[PDB]
Amino acid sequence: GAPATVTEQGEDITSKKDRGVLKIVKRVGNGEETPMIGDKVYVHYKGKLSNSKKFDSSHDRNEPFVFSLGKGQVIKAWDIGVATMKKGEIAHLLIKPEYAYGSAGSLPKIPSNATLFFEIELLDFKGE
Ligand SMILES: COc1ccc(CC[C@H]2OC(=O)[C@@H]3CCCCN3C(=O)[C@@H](C3CCCCC3)NC(=O)C(C)(C)N(C)C(=O)COc3cccc2c3)cc1OC
Numbered sequence: 001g002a003p004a005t006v007t008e009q010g011e012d013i014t015s016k017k018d019r020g021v022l023k024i025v026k027r028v029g030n031g032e033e034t035p036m037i038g039d040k041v042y043v044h045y046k047g048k049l050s051n052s053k054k055f056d057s058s059h060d061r062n063e064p065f066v067f068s069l070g071k072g073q074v075i076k077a078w079d080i081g082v083a084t085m086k087k088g089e090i091a092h093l094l095i096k097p098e099y100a101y102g103s104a105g106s107l108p109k110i111p112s113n114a115t116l117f118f119e120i121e122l123l124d125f126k127g128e
Helices: 002-009 076-082
Strands: 021-027 040-049 065-068 090-095 116-126
Touching: 002 021, 002 090, 002 116, 021 076, 076 090, 076 116
Parallel strands: none
Antiparallel strands: 021 090, 040 065, 040 116, 090 116
């Protein structure tokens, strides 16, 4: 499935070049701009442990998820990954634990040492 394909073929979008955040574009977006550090970004998403059968469904699918890019308001992989996305893009991200919740996890949904997988749709972004 998509997690396997991303591990094998996905682009390494990390500074370390550790294949810790891997990306495949699912739907090509608009233009060439990407959000910048500090911009408010607006997304839809689906996330799971990478070996889970189903995406987590514990958030409202209609209401945009909003955060300030690059400010440590979300896991490291999202700050790196959303920064690479064009408006209207849908992307797959496969994420090693050190770019997510690491050895601590976040129990009960996220165990220690968990690899995560997301589908993210970038709806919009705007600067200060
Ligand atoms: C700077 O580092 C952090 C900053 C903030 C947090 C709190 C959790 C944070 O969640 C996330 O960053 C990711 C990506 C954005 C969507 C939510 N995230 C989740 O990990 C998912 C998770 C994915 C794997 C399957 C289980 C669900 N979390 C959620 O979807 C739910 C709804 C379960 N969750 C509690 C929230 O989305 C809570 O709202 C948040 C709002 C901002 C940041 C975080 C969570 C954790 C951090 O590091 C571990």
